[PDB]
Write an enzyme that holds these catalytic residues in place. Structure first.
Site, PDB file in Angstrom:
ATOM      1  N   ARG A  75       6.227 -10.211  -1.205  1.00 27.66           N
ATOM      2  CA  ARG A  75       7.371 -10.576  -0.376  1.00 27.66           C
ATOM      3  C   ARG A  75       7.706 -12.052  -0.532  1.00 27.66           C
ATOM      4  O   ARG A  75       8.879 -12.427  -0.646  1.00 27.66           O
ATOM      5  CB  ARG A  75       7.078 -10.258   1.090  1.00 27.66           C
ATOM      6  CG  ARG A  75       6.741  -8.809   1.369  1.00 27.66           C
ATOM      7  CD  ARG A  75       7.924  -7.901   1.111  1.00 27.66           C
ATOM      8  NE  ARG A  75       9.065  -8.228   1.956  1.00 27.66           N
ATOM      9  CZ  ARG A  75       9.267  -7.724   3.165  1.00 27.66           C
ATOM     10  NH1 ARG A  75       8.410  -6.881   3.714  1.00 27.66           N
ATOM     11  NH2 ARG A  75      10.359  -8.074   3.838  1.00 27.66           N
ATOM     12  N   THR A  84      -4.658  -2.887   7.877  1.00 33.44           N
ATOM     13  CA  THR A  84      -4.982  -4.278   7.601  1.00 33.44           C
ATOM     14  C   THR A  84      -6.103  -4.806   8.482  1.00 33.44           C
ATOM     15  O   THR A  84      -6.587  -5.918   8.244  1.00 33.44           O
ATOM     16  CB  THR A  84      -3.744  -5.160   7.783  1.00 33.44           C
ATOM     17  OG1 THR A  84      -3.373  -5.182   9.166  1.00 33.44           O
ATOM     18  CG2 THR A  84      -2.585  -4.617   6.968  1.00 33.44           C
ATOM     19  N   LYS A 142       0.809  -1.209   0.000  1.00 29.93           N
ATOM     20  CA  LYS A 142       0.000   0.000   0.000  1.00 29.93           C
ATOM     21  C   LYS A 142       0.846   1.265   0.000  1.00 29.93           C
ATOM     22  O   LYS A 142       0.418   2.288  -0.547  1.00 29.93           O
ATOM     23  CB  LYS A 142      -0.938   0.008   1.208  1.00 29.93           C
ATOM     24  CG  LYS A 142      -2.038  -1.032   1.138  1.00 29.93           C
ATOM     25  CD  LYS A 142      -2.689  -1.229   2.491  1.00 29.93           C
ATOM     26  CE  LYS A 142      -1.928  -2.244   3.318  1.00 29.93           C
ATOM     27  NZ  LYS A 142      -1.787  -3.542   2.608  1.00 29.93           N
ATOM     28  N   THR A 143       2.037   1.220   0.600  1.00 31.92           N
ATOM     29  CA  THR A 143       2.904   2.394   0.603  1.00 31.92           C
ATOM     30  C   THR A 143       3.434   2.697  -0.795  1.00 31.92           C
ATOM     31  O   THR A 143       3.596   3.867  -1.163  1.00 31.92           O
ATOM     32  CB  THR A 143       4.051   2.202   1.597  1.00 31.92           C
ATOM     33  OG1 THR A 143       4.890   3.361   1.590  1.00 31.92           O
ATOM     34  CG2 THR A 143       4.875   0.974   1.253  1.00 31.92           C
ATOM     35  N   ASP A 177       0.474   5.206   7.656  1.00 30.47           N
ATOM     36  CA  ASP A 177       0.445   3.752   7.613  1.00 30.47           C
ATOM     37  C   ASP A 177       0.012   3.202   8.963  1.00 30.47           C
ATOM     38  O   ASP A 177       0.387   3.728  10.014  1.00 30.47           O
ATOM     39  CB  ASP A 177       1.820   3.203   7.232  1.00 30.47           C
ATOM     40  CG  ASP A 177       1.754   1.786   6.692  1.00 30.47           C
ATOM     41  OD1 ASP A 177       1.190   0.909   7.380  1.00 30.47           O
ATOM     42  OD2 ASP A 177       2.269   1.546   5.581  1.00 30.47           O
TER      43      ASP A 177
HETATM   44  N1  LIG Z   1       3.003  -3.743  -7.191  1.00 29.26           N
HETATM   45  C1  LIG Z   1       4.302  -3.542  -6.960  1.00 29.26           C
HETATM   46  N2  LIG Z   1       5.097  -3.196  -7.995  1.00 29.26           N
HETATM   47  C2  LIG Z   1       6.398  -2.994  -7.769  1.00 29.26           C
HETATM   48  N3  LIG Z   1       7.072  -3.081  -6.619  1.00 29.26           N
HETATM   49  C3  LIG Z   1       6.259  -3.424  -5.611  1.00 29.26           C
HETATM   50  C4  LIG Z   1       4.898  -3.666  -5.691  1.00 29.26           C
HETATM   51  N4  LIG Z   1       4.385  -3.995  -4.446  1.00 29.26           N
HETATM   52  C5  LIG Z   1       5.429  -3.944  -3.656  1.00 29.26           C
HETATM   53  N5  LIG Z   1       6.595  -3.606  -4.292  1.00 29.26           N
HETATM   54  C6  LIG Z   1       7.916  -3.468  -3.686  1.00 29.26           C
HETATM   55  O1  LIG Z   1       7.795  -3.692  -2.296  1.00 29.26           O
HETATM   56  C7  LIG Z   1       8.711  -2.836  -1.575  1.00 29.26           C
HETATM   57  C8  LIG Z   1       7.952  -1.996  -0.575  1.00 29.26           C
HETATM   58  O2  LIG Z   1       7.225  -2.852   0.336  1.00 29.26           O
HETATM   59  P1  LIG Z   1       5.717  -3.202   0.038  1.00 29.26           P
HETATM   60  O3  LIG Z   1       5.533  -4.708  -0.168  1.00 29.26           O
HETATM   61  O4  LIG Z   1       5.343  -2.348  -1.105  1.00 29.26           O
HETATM   62  O5  LIG Z   1       4.894  -2.805   1.338  1.00 29.26           O
HETATM   63  P2  LIG Z   1       3.385  -3.284   1.545  1.00 29.26           P
HETATM   64  O6  LIG Z   1       2.737  -3.488   0.168  1.00 29.26           O
HETATM   65  O7  LIG Z   1       2.638  -2.316   2.378  1.00 29.26           O
HETATM   66  O8  LIG Z   1       3.369  -4.705   2.231  1.00 29.26           O
HETATM   67  P3  LIG Z   1       2.856  -4.859   3.693  1.00 29.26           P
HETATM   68  O9  LIG Z   1       1.849  -6.048   3.754  1.00 29.26           O
HETATM   69  O10 LIG Z   1       2.142  -3.545   4.126  1.00 29.26           O
HETATM   70  S1  LIG Z   1       4.349  -5.217   4.894  1.00 29.26           S
HETATM   71  C9  LIG Z   1       9.479  -2.044  -2.634  1.00 29.26           C
HETATM   72  O11 LIG Z   1      10.726  -2.662  -2.926  1.00 29.26           O
HETATM   73  C10 LIG Z   1       8.538  -2.083  -3.839  1.00 29.26           C
HETATM   74  O12 LIG Z   1       9.257  -1.986  -5.063  1.00 29.26           O
HETATM   75 MG   LIG Z   2       2.314  -5.049   6.973  1.00 30.33          MG
END
Ligand SMILES: Nc1ncnc2c1ncn2[C@@H]1O[C@H](COP(=O)(O)OP(=O)(O)OP(O)(O)=S)[C@@H](O)[C@H]1O
Ligand SMILES: [Mg+2]
Ligand SMILES: Nc1ncnc2c1ncn2[C@@H]1O[C@H](COP(=O)(O)OP(=O)(O)O)[C@@H](O)[C@H]1O
Lengths: 308, 309
Positions: B197, B138, B45-46, B89
């Site tokens: 991840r 979440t 989401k970030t 967040d």
């Molecule tokens: N759709 C996407 N396209 C490209 N990079 C992504 C994408 N989703 C996540 N990332 C990568 O993920 C990293 C940042 O963490 P994120 O997975 O985006 O955090 P998050 O989506 O909020 O996961 P959680 O569940 O909140 S810990 C960076 O290296 C981004 O490049």
């Molecule tokens: Mg998380």
């Protein structure tokens, strides 16, 4: 023990001559008495006068101290204060500069403000009309802004020996001890024009007379008890006699000097500057000549010395 | 780090409406309405918040829930310009004191600031520039009704697909300089749990195996032996989840068991079993939570190659 009428109050004739007028006018107009300030030395009966005033007006009274008081002043003004009730504050000059500023709106417009809890917005209370009585030793102890909200300002003077004798006789008849009038007059004369001093002196004299088994406190027994306590015919203590002696026999009425003040007494310039001199000056036996303190002829005659 | 909305991997359903909302907001020369993003953790989401901010051409103010009560005023009044974006967040972790200081700043753009500090002093209402706030949680349950009421746009993040995960694996391989074939990345994404991840971690492990093997290119088969040595199915279950299902089916007949008995049988912590392994056994139709215990569904029997009940 406390009297409940101006007639039973002993010896403040000059003050009573006007207090009666003010109380009569306030009662006739059916409105609270104006704020009153009582001056005068301690032990003369200010709290008793406050109680007498409350009984004369037929209203409740709420004695509190000066340094007793923040927001607690409003706490004690808001709950226990109905329509005009004397609120006696002893030692009015000792108020901190936190509630003294809060006194002015409360005693001028009868409104008070309290803030706590955060909101914490000001809540203004419509205080009921009331009368405040304050007590302090001197006019100069209180600030000029405070000596302006008091409608009536009165002074309280020392009692004469006869009035102290009447008070001692009243105390004796209340407690249940028989005393001759001349003994009470002697006790009052040895009192330094103070009511509580006379009360304590009479209690000590009756303590000395009880052990001897005498049912009536004669003049001779009173004189013996007073001599045992260490008081002369003018009420001076042993410290006063010895300081007068070490002045007269070592300087002959000249200046005493700061160096010799502690030499013959081995004491710091403490009680000498505030507890001994004022009574000696009041009795007229000591004069503060600009050249130096001078013992008058009263000291010479009182200390058993031949006339000059 | 993606910059534009076309570089984002796989939120097609959300991106389709996000484009429309952002274009409408830009056309009016008006800041976007407050946004709330739901979704299971691990979906990024970030990254979507950063992409939205870049698309709007506006700087960021990123902050988590448990950051420091009064710091909200600081972050709101320090670095917020006209139309600035504030991203909180984990917005369900805000304290009640800090929660009852933000919705005045969401509905009226006025914040009360404690000025005297120290003892119980007074406060002043201060005007802030119009801004958009993006929240990401979440756990929608802990979001109170008033807090949810001030959010103009509410959207959900859904799990990715094997193809989008394969695209992410390809992007990571290109960044790291590792040669991987399309079908290998598709297999890695298939064995992931619809999460980025997990896909990246699987790709790194397969990279380690291939590098140790001395192979300059990762093809379909090499990925297959790497994932087999990792102990993984075609669905993403490790050896431990298969063991859980087999113990549930064989030892207890598939009937209700209970957390304590199953954990004792598996020599595992009951909390570890309940909070680490079970949530993906559910969401796949392989397990149920009856009040009388835990039951294995028919999908569990089919997946393990056991005769149906
Ligand atoms: N759709 C996407 N396209 C490209 N990079 C992504 C994408 N989703 C996540 N990332 C990568 O993920 C990293 C940042 O963490 P994120 O997975 O985006 O955090 P998050 O989506 O909020 O996961 P959680 O569940 O909140 S810990 C960076 O290296 C981004 O490049
Ligand atoms: Mg998380
Ligand atoms: N005029 C009086 N008549 C009778 N008793 C008095 C009189 N003045 C004072 N007293 C006695 O003195 C006491 C109050 O004196 P005190 O409280 O020492 O004065 P202050 O309030 O100035 O210190 C009371 O118990 C009262 O019995």
């Amino acid at each position: 023990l406390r009297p409940k009428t101006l007639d039973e109050y002993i010896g403040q004739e000059r003050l009573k001559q006007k207090l009666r007028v003010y109380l009569e006018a306030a009662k006739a107009r059916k409105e609270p008495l104006e704020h009153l300030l009582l001056f005068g030395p301690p032990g003369l009966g200010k709290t008793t006068l406050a109680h007498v005033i409350a009984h004369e007006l037929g209203v409740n009274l709420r004695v509190t101290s000066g340094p007793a008081i923040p927001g607690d002043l409003a706490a004690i003004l808001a709950n226990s204060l109905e329509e005009g009730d004397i609120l006696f504050i002893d030692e009015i000059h000792r108020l901190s500069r936190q509630a003294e500023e809060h006194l002015y709106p409360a005693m001028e417009d009868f409104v008070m403000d309290i803030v706590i809890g955060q909101a914490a917005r000001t809540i203004r209370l419509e205080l009921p009309r009331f009368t405040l009585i304050g007590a302090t030793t001197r006019p100069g102890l209180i600030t000029a802004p405070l000596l302006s909200r008091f409608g009536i300002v009165e002074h309280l003077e020392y009692y004469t020996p006869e009035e102290l004798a009447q008070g001692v006789m009243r105390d004796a008849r209340l407690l249940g001890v028989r005393i001759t009038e001349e003994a009470a007059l002697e006790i009052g004369r040895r009192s330094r024009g103070t009511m509580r001093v006379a009360k304590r002196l009479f209690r000590r004299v009756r303590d000395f007379a009880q052990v001897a088994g005498e049912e009536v406190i004669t003049r001779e027994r009173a004189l013996e008890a007073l001599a045992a306590l260490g008081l002369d015919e003018l009420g001076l203590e042993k410290r006063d006699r010895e300081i007068l002696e070490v002045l007269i026999l070592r300087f002959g009425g000249g200046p005493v000097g700061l160096a010799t003040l502690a030499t013959a007494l081995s004491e710091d310039p403490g009680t000498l500057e505030e507890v001994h001199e004022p009574y000696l000056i009041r009795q007229g036996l000591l004069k503060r000549t600009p050249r130096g303190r001078v013992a008058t002829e009263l000291a010479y005659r009182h200390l058993g010395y031949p006339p000059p």
